[PDB]
Amino acid sequence: VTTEILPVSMTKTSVDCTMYICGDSTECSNLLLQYGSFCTQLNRALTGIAVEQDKNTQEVFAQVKQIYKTPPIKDFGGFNFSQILPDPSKPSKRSFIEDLLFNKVFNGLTVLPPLLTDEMIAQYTSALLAGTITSGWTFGAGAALQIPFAMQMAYRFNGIGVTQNVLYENQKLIANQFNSAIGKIQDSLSSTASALGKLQDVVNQNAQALNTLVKQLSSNFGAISSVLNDILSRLDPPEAEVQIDRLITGRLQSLQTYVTQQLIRAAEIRASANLAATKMSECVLGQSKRVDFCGKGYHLMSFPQSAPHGVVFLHV
Amino acid sequence: NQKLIANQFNSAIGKIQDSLSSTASALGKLQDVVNQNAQALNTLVKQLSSNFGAISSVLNDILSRLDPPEAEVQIDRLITGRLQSLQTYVTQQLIRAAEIRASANLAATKMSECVLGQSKRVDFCGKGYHLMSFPQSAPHGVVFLHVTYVPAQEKNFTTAPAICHDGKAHFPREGVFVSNGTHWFVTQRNFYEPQIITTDNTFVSGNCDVVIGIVNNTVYDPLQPE
Amino acid sequence: DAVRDPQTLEILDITPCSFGGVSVITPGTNTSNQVAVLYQDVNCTEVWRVYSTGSNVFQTRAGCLIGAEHVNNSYECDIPIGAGICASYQSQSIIAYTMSLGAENSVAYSNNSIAIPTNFTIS
Amino acid sequence: FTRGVYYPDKVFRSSVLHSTQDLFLPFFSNVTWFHNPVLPFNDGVYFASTSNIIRGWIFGTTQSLLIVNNVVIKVCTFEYVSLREFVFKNIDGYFKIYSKHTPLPQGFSALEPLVDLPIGINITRFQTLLAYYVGYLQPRTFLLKYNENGTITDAVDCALDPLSETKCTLKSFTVEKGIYQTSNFRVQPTESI
Ligand SMILES: *[C@@H]1O[C@H](CO)[C@@H](O[C@@H]2O[C@H](CO)[C@@H](O)[C@H](O)[C@H]2NC(C)=O)[C@H](O)[C@H]1NC(C)=O
Ligand SMILES: *[C@@H]1O[C@H](CO)[C@@H](O[C@@H]2O[C@H](CO)[C@@H](O)[C@H](O)[C@H]2NC(C)=O)[C@H](O)[C@H]1NC(C)=O
Ligand SMILES: *[C@@H]1O[C@H](CO)[C@@H](O[C@@H]2O[C@H](CO)[C@@H](O)[C@H](O)[C@H]2NC(C)=O)[C@H](O)[C@H]1NC(C)=O
Ligand SMILES: *[C@@H]1O[C@H](CO)[C@@H](O[C@@H]2O[C@H](CO)[C@@H](O)[C@H](O)[C@H]2NC(C)=O)[C@H](O)[C@H]1NC(C)=O
Ligand SMILES: *[C@@H]1O[C@H](CO)[C@@H](O[C@@H]2O[C@H](CO)[C@@H](O)[C@H](O)[C@H]2NC(C)=O)[C@H](O)[C@H]1NC(C)=O
Ligand SMILES: *[C@@H]1O[C@H](CO)[C@@H](O)[C@H](O)[C@H]1NC(C)=O
Ligand SMILES: *[C@@H]1O[C@H](CO)[C@@H](O)[C@H](O)[C@H]1NC(C)=O
Ligand SMILES: *[C@@H]1O[C@H](CO)[C@@H](O)[C@H](O)[C@H]1NC(C)=O
Ligand SMILES: *[C@@H]1O[C@H](CO)[C@@H](O)[C@H](O)[C@H]1NC(C)=O
């Protein structure tokens, strides 16, 4: 049993262009109108990014029609799924592994909330697990058809070229090896390793860019000050024109650089989310023949778990 | 079932035709590309009526009102303002072209693997079990028509992993053992078609006290009178 | 963010004023002319007169929503507001609800039962 | 209802949606009904009337423009000789009269410019000269709709209600279903310290 982590979405931001360039200064915002429509371009670009971030999450996680439930009598041939099934004693839908995963990882600048909450994403992953464990690969092609778990496991052995008496005659050994591998996953996440590094990199790259954008407001760009009220209290209007123009030019260049790098960075989070949608459909809802697409070895089955802005797959 | 299968296919093609000729619009992914590119060109054209700090946004009536010392002072403001807007247009066109290229690469992969073959990848060529697909052309796009098999009208049974007959464990060659309540049969997995359990459709492996859940029944031997 | 009074030498804090954004939820204008108005994150105690006061006031995690009737059903999402809340047009008015993820289902699992399909459908 | 829209300039336009920022009579305002009290001239006046009793007008702060009625104007110096709706503006030493008359109803109509009288006086009040209304102009922003013949057939007041501000942001008169960012808000400071 191995692990694969993928980024899915990123943080939805919006920047108020007029307030960033000159908040509460009508003699600056009258000079800004001589540049046409730069601020509406910048707002339209950032809004397109924010909508795409909800679409990525929909297409990775909402791949079931029903909300399937697992039965209260848990007799799966000796296989133990309790570390990855949800625990209702804690008040969320979140499972044990997913608790570990969530514990491991103003000048006009706001953050918009996501459409799907963490509870909704956890309910989707638990329906995917319950569907897999009780009905094989049949719920991904039609209606879910129940089958005993060892018989499911027998025809998955049959799909990698091994006859099914090998499964039925080594059943207790196979269940013990599965349970120990899940236990080792749980231990190495519970230790202090830096496992969620791909998810941490996205958060760091988005924090550095907002800090650079805020720090650019204290440059004076050739003007006598970088505070706009100091200029408006010291100078007459015909001489304050040429100082406010220098500040406006520098601040527009700062916003334009930020939005260009956000568009390039969102283009690669799309590709990551399209890959995670493909892995959900081909490794969780089916059994895959593609070499190394779902782990290392001959693929038997995969399970999903939710993470902050990401997804974790466990490949058996 | 050939006549039933042909009639279900013909009805589904007719419903595709109906939900396109009705005004429920579905070509939204193709209309978005057109709208975004038209909007970008309209923004680039409207940026020629800004004065960027100069006395006029028209260049002929700077050149007709001023002398070459202080006409260049006004012309440099318009030059920098118009370069910046051309630069912004070109950069966002290069970012949109890369997304259209990734979509065209996916479409070329699907033409190879769903039209020129049958695919085992789940949900790549539609929902269900993939049979075949047909291409149709569209303005700046392509439409695929995927044909899939969907199981219907399921029914409960009782099952077992193996059968014990003469101190030996019997397993299916290709299928599952099912019971209607009193008798035991063997059927294929995706369609109910029950048959008698003989030695031609099972194989034997070991004695019958290792398997969890084995069932006593009779395995028939087809060379009976000899 | 802090300063000292030049007369009483008191340390007194500076904080900015309210400042949100404003969004307008609409159906099509070939359907109605009613709107609802969302204010981005302002606690509804700080907030045009008809669409600024009155009844139909609801506090979401996205902000303050004025002009929509909060109900207790759950529907498919129609117009997304954020953090689970959607809006739709349904005597006709505008309603705000928690979105629903789909139909509830439970599979009849046991250790010796199987479902086999008996027919099929071409799609 | 929807009255008192004129032509802002003298540029021909056809089948466009131009945005205008000028002094207009806001939609659904309250106009006084008269049936001759001396009225003030705030910054611009809508006038209508509904025979042949209304002759002309008296202008000025008490030099005082006089328009009587055959049309003769006696601005006091200069003299000029050349349902009924009228618009008066006193902008930058000029005096712009916009007017149109028809066969208050709901129908939309636009007032064409009549004459400019570049006089440069001060006016704070006025009075009619013998069923007439008085509106007052506000700084607005409209969204006019021209046609194939280059005539205005519709407009939108971009500060009446939220749907109108949505229509002015999208620059259309039909709005699809959705959610749209339109503006910002900010509490103003109450006093200085
Ligand atoms: C499935 O695994 C869990 C965790 O390993 C088992 O729960 C443990 O059960 C023992 C008793 O045998 C307790 O002492 C531990 O404290 C339990 N751990 C936790 C985290 O609850 C569970 O019993 C296993 N299920 C089966 C059927 O064996
Ligand atoms: C197969 O058998 C199961 C078990 O009897 C059926 O599931 C029950 O269906 C009834 C209504 O038909 C429900 O009231 C019960 O709650 C279900 N039981 C459980 C445990 O979920 C199932 O409907 C049968 N399927 C078919 C196709 O006949
Ligand atoms: C299970 O299937 C068997 C098929 O062999 C059914 O047995 C047949 O039933 C019909 C009707 O009574 C008889 O005409 C046949 O002679 C029977 N065949 C045999 C070999 O006995 C049986 O009825 C089915 N049981 C149930 C509960 O459906
Ligand atoms: C399945 O058949 C076998 C073969 O008869 C049964 O095993 C023996 O059955 C006899 C009676 O028929 C008993 O006296 C023996 O003690 C059984 N053997 C053992 C090792 O217990 C077996 O019981 C049958 N299974 C079921 C569930 O009835
Ligand atoms: C399998 O499904 C098909 C499709 O529904 C069934 O065919 C229909 O049968 C009904 C009679 O109950 C007719 O009224 C319909 O006209 C048939 N449809 C078509 C397209 O021919 C078929 O009978 C089912 N087979 C079985 C064995 O139940
Ligand atoms: C299946 O579960 C039932 C409990 O309802 C039990 O009696 C039976 O022994 C189990 N069968 C197997 C093969 O474990
Ligand atoms: C809104 O303000 C009240 C105090 O009047 C406070 O109790 C409440 O926590 C605030 N809610 C939010 C969401 O800020
Ligand atoms: C909605 O549910 C709440 C329960 O928290 C209840 O108090 C309220 O009355 C319900 N609304 C209606 C209209 O019944
Ligand atoms: C424009 O005016 C002409 C009159 O010359 C008329 O025939 C035509 O119908 C008008 N167009 C529209 C759209 O009303």
Author numbering:
A (entry chain B): 722 to 826, 855 to 1065
B (entry chain A): 919 to 1144
C (entry chain A): 574 to 620, 633 to 675, 689 to 721
D (entry chain A): 32 to 66, 81 to 95, 98 to 109, 115 to 121, 125 to 131, 167 to 172, 189 to 209, 216 to 242, ...
What is the paper's account of this structure, in its own sentences?
A major focus of SARS-CoV-2 research involves the trimeric spike glycoprotein, a type-1 fusion machine responsible for receptor engagement and viral entry into target cells. As is the general case for type-1 fusion proteins, the mature spike is embedded in the viral membrane in a metastable prefusion conformation, which undergoes large structural rearrangements as it transitions to its postfusion form, a transition that facilitates merging of viral and target cell membranes and virus entry into the cell. Two proline mutations, originally developed for the MERS coronavirus spike, have been shown to stabilize the soluble trimeric ectodomain in its prefusion conformation. When combined with the T4-bacteriophage foldon trimerization domain and a mutated furin site to prevent cleavage, the “S2P” construct has become the de facto protein format for research into the biological function of the SARS-CoV-2 spike.
